[PDB]
Amino acid sequence: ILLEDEDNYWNQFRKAEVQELNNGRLAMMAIVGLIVQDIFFGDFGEVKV
Amino acid sequence: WRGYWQELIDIILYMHLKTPILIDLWNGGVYTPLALSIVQARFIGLVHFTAGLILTYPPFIISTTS
Amino acid sequence: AIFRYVNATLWSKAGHFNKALSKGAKTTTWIWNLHASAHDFDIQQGSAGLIARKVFSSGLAHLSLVFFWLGGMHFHGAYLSNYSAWLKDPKSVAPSSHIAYSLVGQDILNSYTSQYFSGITITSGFFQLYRSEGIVTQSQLKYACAASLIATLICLSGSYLHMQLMSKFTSFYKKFQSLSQSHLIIMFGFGSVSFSAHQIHEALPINSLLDSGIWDPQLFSAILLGTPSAITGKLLNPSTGSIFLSQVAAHHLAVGIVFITLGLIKWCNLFFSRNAILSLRLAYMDYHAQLSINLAVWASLSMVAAHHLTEIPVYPYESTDYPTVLCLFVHHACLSGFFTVASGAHASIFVIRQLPTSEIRHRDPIIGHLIWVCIALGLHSFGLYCHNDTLEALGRPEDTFCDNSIQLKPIFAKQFLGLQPGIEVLDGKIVRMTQELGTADFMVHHIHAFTIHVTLLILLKGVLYARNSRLVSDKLELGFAYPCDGPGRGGTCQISPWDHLFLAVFWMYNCLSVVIFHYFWKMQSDVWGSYVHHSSLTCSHYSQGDFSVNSITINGWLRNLLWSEASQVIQSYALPSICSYGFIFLAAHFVWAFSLMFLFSGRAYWQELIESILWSHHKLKIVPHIQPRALSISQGRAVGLTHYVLGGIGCTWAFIISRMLVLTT
Amino acid sequence: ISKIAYLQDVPRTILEADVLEKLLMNTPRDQWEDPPEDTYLYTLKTFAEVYGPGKATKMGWWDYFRLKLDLPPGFELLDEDEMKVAADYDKLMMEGKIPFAVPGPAGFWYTGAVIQWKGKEQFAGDQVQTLTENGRFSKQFLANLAFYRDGLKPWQRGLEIGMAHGYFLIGPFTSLGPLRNTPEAATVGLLCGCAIVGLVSIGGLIFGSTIKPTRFDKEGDKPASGFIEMINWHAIGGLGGAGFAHALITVFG
Amino acid sequence: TAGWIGWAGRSYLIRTNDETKELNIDVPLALTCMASGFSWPVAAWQEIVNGEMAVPSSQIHPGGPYTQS
Amino acid sequence: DERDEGLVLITPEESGKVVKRDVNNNPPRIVMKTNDWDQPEIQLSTGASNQINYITPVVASDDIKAWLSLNVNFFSILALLTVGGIIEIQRFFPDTLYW
Amino acid sequence: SSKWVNPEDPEMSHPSGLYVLPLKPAKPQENYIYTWKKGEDGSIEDYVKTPFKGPERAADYYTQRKGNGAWDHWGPQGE
Amino acid sequence: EIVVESIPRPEDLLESPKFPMFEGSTGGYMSRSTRERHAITWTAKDQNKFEMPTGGFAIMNKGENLCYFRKKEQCISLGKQLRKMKIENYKIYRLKKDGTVIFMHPADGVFPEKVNKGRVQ
Ligand SMILES: CC1=C(/C=C/C(C)=C/C=C/C(C)=C/C=C/C=C(C)/C=C/C=C(C)/C=C/C2=C(C)CCCC2(C)C)C(C)(C)CCC1
């Protein structure tokens, strides 16, 4: 049902896709770093909500 | 009164006819749901009113006189 | 600008504004229509410029009315009040700026408030408001009254002038960017900064002296002097039981700075996502759209005010003034409900008069899912109560939903204040105490959600199906306020957005009544009361903590809340203080019952009865040429709704206020 | 444009050149000739016909103040980009395409996607496209449900559906029934679940006897025979699934 | 007092005989009728006796039709 | 209309063409029809003017008397007087001791 | 001037109250249902109108309806 | 003398130049559960924005336009709106399940409000 090749201004699906990919890449690096740091120094990136 | 409830029934019927499994079995053609007519609803509300009013007293009289 | 066209000639025409009323007074329906359409400036004779003129001038006239009411409040406080006795000793003396005459034995209404004063105990918190503002003298109150009266006169003059200053070219009311910027930067930002200045310069010294016990004129005529490093709200004034007024002043300064910053970033265009709202910006440049949005905003703010005025104490001694806090909460909750249903109404009017937004094109799924969620919420939430009732009656408490039995723990209801253990007390009363949530709170909160969702369902259905529906496709042609489309198609009663509001008001009233009862009972049982002696206190609550044990059943609500706590109002006749409250209880019951007349009956019976009655008048030559008519269908609905809501609200008002007054005195 | 008399050499005091350009751009072209009464362009026309070169070159302070009050400033009118965005939005909606959004807290977010709102039948409200029902995943899932799966006999459909239904149905009575604390809680819950399966299967038999759906029927077969077979096998599968769940509960505590 | 009120009123209605006067009261005439209503007992008995009080039922609408025409 | 007597009231077509001063020495004023019943006409100034522009409304005793003759004011005044009379009777002779 | 002829009572007008006889199609539409059509290459359509041999619901109530009129009371001219 | 238009079944006419440009909504006829239809066909000199009786708005093509609805009431309301716009050539047809087309609204080619010869009470 999606129309990716629509020449309207309200067609920022490329923006949505790139946002997804960039956030996912950052989250990959972040989760690997969190796990490695927890395993090494017992630091799990404690949050102070 | 009836118009509000007829429109609500129309929306509910739309939901039933859009449901995946239910649509393929139930068309809605036979006994198509409808809101109660004006006189039917007058009578039903009167029956509820009368039943509540009459039947809420005997408990009170029994409790007080027993 | 031309004031020669304002003459009293039109005063006696009585219907000039509406063209449909040209054939003056052929029936009483004409009178009723005159009143109904008096303030519907859109459908009145004239032009859009005249509509804007009337809207703005009426807003200013209402502003003057509110200023007059505030000035009257100040005058009553100054001259017809025991504010002096209350200020010196708030606990002993109940607030009272209200005195009744001795006409027919009516002096019995006045009750003992002080040694030298007898009157009616007020519950508006005006004494606490004055104390917070630093008003401690009759001269100060008198000058506040004078300022309010001067503001009333100024607003009246402004309305009268603007009725002619604004011409057909006038467009300042369409400058939404300018309007919003001015309101955000000056009315809100500068206003908050100026009030923080007022607090710091006047209220802080006076309030500090009052807390100490100093009442010296020279002193009455060094910020953060007494406030420790404790977070605001985590430490209440030990001698007043309220947040430090210096903390309040700092709050207002910060809020004003934040508002100014928001306005300045908007001015600089720092906000970027204009497109996401551009559709609404284009669609909702309408009187009714803005009225609906503002009504909803103020309804939500009123509800937040109702919650915060009690949960977060900021006025001196209002925490221990139990009638005041209760009345404030209840009043603002009721206003929230009324303004929310108003927002629904004017959303419907905007849809009728203007093009709706595109979310109306999939209205069937929206209302269908709302119907389902309403049904499921009502079923589960109320059927838990019904299950508790049935099982407890059968004699199986172990099968009911309660803390001792099956328990529905509110896991998500988590603390955020991080307060220290214990409670805060002030002179034999519990100013602040944590509310402990359990199965009863879970059930009552889901009842709240159910009622809110059903009211929203009615309002949203009225809004979305205003233009047309499967039943009738020309509802737009029918308009906004029509009784029906006919007995056809099964019957098209109450298909109009007006009738959708007429039902949403019933549902809002039901929701707010349940909310009021929940707040009242929970506060009486688990928060308010006295204490009996590191020290540990046993807290004796007014309702004796019966909410958590009895609120789990509808019978418990009927017995421990209505019947048990109606002892004060029901037995108030002999007592001088609350005999008026008992009488108002009775009269509100009468009015509520009388509303059912109009809510159940129909136009035709009354029209035929009126004709039969008029036969005798004609026989005796009493011929009324304004021919009597039965009230229209919509008017009958409106009258029934008004009387119903007024009677219910009056019963609740008298009941709660009598209980609180007797318990606290 | 040059053909408009009142728009020629409008004095800067009455309205700035940039603001005039913005106002003309915002206003529809056809309205320039004789704008409607309640418009900034109408006010500008009315006052430029009376003031300017060759006409009244002075105005009272109050009259000028009111004129500047009721004429528009530059920031009040829409920009080129804003007008383009609004035009694109309206064009999309009229073409039958919806810039996808999901409601959020007291609002809705735009996901940046353009979907085809109108279905194959343009006038059919049943066919409006949505990811929930008309997406590839939803289509495949619903088509692969037992009620719909290809190459399945009615007995297979009913057996699978009943297995699922009974297996999950026994549990509520087992855990929250009156005898939930008694040693026979599991068996009583199994009995209640089997009763529920029987009741729903009886209802399905009534449905197939009254409405008689014929989508599962073989060619040259009695109407609703396939549906009745499916319902009977749903009853069988419900019994089996309830028994299996009860056996698992009993064996594994 | 009640007969005074009723008489006054009926007298205003008879004298005016107009919806416009019913809406915009002719205050002079209204006050005149209010003052005049003090002799209502004698005036009413005299009108009843002389036939100026009640009109025959054939001069007024009887009600809905209960039969075929 | 006596208010604008002696004023030079030019139509919008004659704006700037007529520059004759008024009786009060003010410049001519442009008159425009607005098609508003409340303000049928509006006047703009061609320059600084020294003229009387009353902001007070034109109210006639006849209009006030008609407004009070409106049935609402008549009956509200009647009812207010009646209620005041009953209240004062209750004040002066409480409890109906005479009866 | 109405071409429709009342079947029950020739003197009276047709219950339909129309003046132009109906137009039959070249080939009458056959019974169909909206279902999925797996594309054989991994694709799938949602609302595909596919032929259905008989009535979708063989209830007497459903099958008795012919659509000629409100009560199927229009004469042969209705078809 | 009156000629009944072909008016193909909506399920057959998936895309046509006649259909006006309209937004679409859930207020359209339920294709799964109903088969009877009503078609309204008119001719417009210009593209006038008009409101569909089923939900949102629409734009009528310059030339011939055709719309499908479920009820004669919807068709007649749209026809009244077109008459307000001074489009007097619109016709309404009822489409049976099998494709039979019955010319309905201008039953004899003259609008009912206008008196016509050959009409009997
Ligand atoms: C697909 C399927 C299915 C299906 C189902 C169904 C489809 C169902 C339905 C069902 C039904 C369909 C049911 C029914 C029911 C019924 C009822 C519930 C009834 C009631 C009744 C009443 C209530 C009545 C009454 C009466 C009487 C008896 C007499 C007279 C009077 C009166 C009217 C009152 C199942 C799940 C199985 C499984 C899977 C597969």
Ligand SMILES: CC1=C(/C=C/C(C)=C/C=C/C(C)=C/C=C/C=C(C)/C=C/C=C(C)/C=C/C2=C(C)CCCC2(C)C)C(C)(C)CCC1
């Ligand atoms: C959405 C969601 C979800 C859902 C889920 C579900 C809904 C599930 C279901 C589940 C189920 C519902 C399951 C079931 C299963 C079943 C089974 C596993 C069965 C079995 C059976 C058997 C095995 C049987 C057998 C038999 C028979 C049939 C007969 C004869 C006898 C015997 C025994 C042989 C969740 C939560 C995840 C979360 C996320 C989201």
Ligand SMILES: CC1=C(C/C=C(\C)CCC[C@H](C)CCC[C@H](C)CCCC(C)C)C(=O)c2ccccc2C1=O
């Ligand atoms: C009673 C009733 C009537 C008849 C009621 C009428 C005509 C109202 C009478 C109006 C009077 C004349 C207004 C004057 C106000 C009261 C007489 C004030 C009494 C105050 C007391 C304190 C004395 C309807 O016409 C009607 C129409 C549609 C739905 C329901 C109903 C309905 O319930």
